[PDB]
Amino acid sequence: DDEEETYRLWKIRKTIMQLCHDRGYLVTQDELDQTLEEFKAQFGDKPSEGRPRRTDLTVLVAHNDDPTDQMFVFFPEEPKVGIKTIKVYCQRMQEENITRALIVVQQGMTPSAKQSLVDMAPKYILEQFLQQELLINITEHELVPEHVVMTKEEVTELLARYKLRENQLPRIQAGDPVARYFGIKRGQVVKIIRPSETAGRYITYRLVQ
């Protein structure tokens, strides 16, 4: 049905806006709170007819501090995604000279596709994100506390205060859903702020492994 899939497309787009805003990318306040009425007016109502088309939903954002640091958000039409699809999207990333992208798939990627993503990761960073996983913002859940990605100066200041090594910190996997949400690689440190029954506030730090 067109109405419910339009609802999914709007919710995916809103979650991507919140995600890009959380990563520091310049996303304006109008498109954070884009209502379903506004999405229907701007994009369409009948995706099977093709008024909202997934390749028309492709987002381009830029970082706040660095305008040239840009990230694409792609929405493939086909449910699976194979090698030719990443090849097309990566040629597109070459011809705007952009090294970061998200791929919001519907059903998923074949293992060769993920292997190709890992292979091309040193030059262009490509993050697969299922539509089912993006249908909510998990950082708005009550169980998920506040994650802040730390800069390198802050990490060095942390490890000098606690006289710590990197492997002596607590760990978080690079495939963690919040780690995938914030798009963080190994060696980065996440400052977790959470409330505390005993202290009120507690700040944990987690190295990405």
Partner: protein, 240 residues
């Protein structure tokens, strides 16, 4: 020392006279048990004549068992409350219960008024024979005395069916103790070996034997648990 040497003057006992209730209380308990058994018979007639409406989330057995158990538990509670209201200030069961030294009001209820329903695995006494709990009952007898409701007290003494069903109930507790010991000990051993080397270090962090930080402060506030107390925040609940 002081209280034990005053107890030589005052003295403290328990006897068969502390488990006696009034004649009026015996009549009240008998009336409550008779009315509750009649209510169970009425629910049985409703289910037998297909007039029992199932509740959301439950089958017809589950609604019938829940309603019968609610009636029987209300009977046990009301007979118990009558038993405790019958007690004098000189009663010694009450003397040890209100001091918290030994026993509960449930023990007073069972000794004085009604032992109550005997349960095996959370349900009533099962049909261990072909649709009978014992061969002294008719088949498909879902009444209280057939399925393990002991309507006698410990002073009145249990009938042979009630005695057997109470033995069935107590065997459950014996089994639960004897099979919970090993699993609980294994859980304790695994917890110890998982956290034996975790300790507060001299920079007040909490780290294991690999020197990896588990907590930056103990309990997130750095305080020992033997000196913290329950308190109330005076600004949380009041209105603006």
């Amino acid at each position: 020392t002081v209280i034990n040497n005053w107890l030589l003057i005052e003295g403290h006992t328990i006897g068969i006279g502390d488990s006696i209730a009034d004649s009026k209380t015996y009549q009240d308990i008998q009336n409550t048990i008779k009315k509750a058994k009649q209510d169970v018979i009425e629910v049985i007639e409703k289910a037998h004549n297909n007039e029992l409406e199932p509740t959301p989330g439950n089958t017809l057995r589950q609604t019938f068992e829940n309603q019968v158990n609610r009636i029987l538990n209300d009977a046990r509670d009301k007979t118990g409350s009558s038993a405790q209201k019958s007690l004098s200030e000189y009663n010694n069961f009450k003397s040890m219960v209100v001091s918290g030294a030994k026993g509960s009001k449930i023990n007073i209820s069972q000794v004085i008024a009604v032992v109550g329903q005997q349960n095996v695995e959370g349900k009533r006494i099962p049909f261990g024979f072909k649709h009978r709990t014992l061969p002294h009952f008719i088949k498909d007898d879902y009444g209280p005395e057939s399925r393990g409701f002991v309507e006698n007290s410990y002073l009145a003494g249990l009938t042979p069916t009630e005695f057997f069903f109470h033995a069935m109930g107590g065997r459950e507790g014996l089994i639960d103790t004897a099979v919970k010991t090993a699993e609980t000990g294994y859980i304790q051993r695994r917890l110890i070996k998982s956290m034996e080397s975790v300790m507060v270090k001299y920079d007040a962090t909490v780290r294991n034997s690999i020197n990896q930080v588990v907590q930056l402060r103990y309990g997130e506030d750095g305080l020992a648990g033997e000196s913290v107390e329950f308190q109330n925040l005076a600004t949380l609940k009041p209105s603006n």
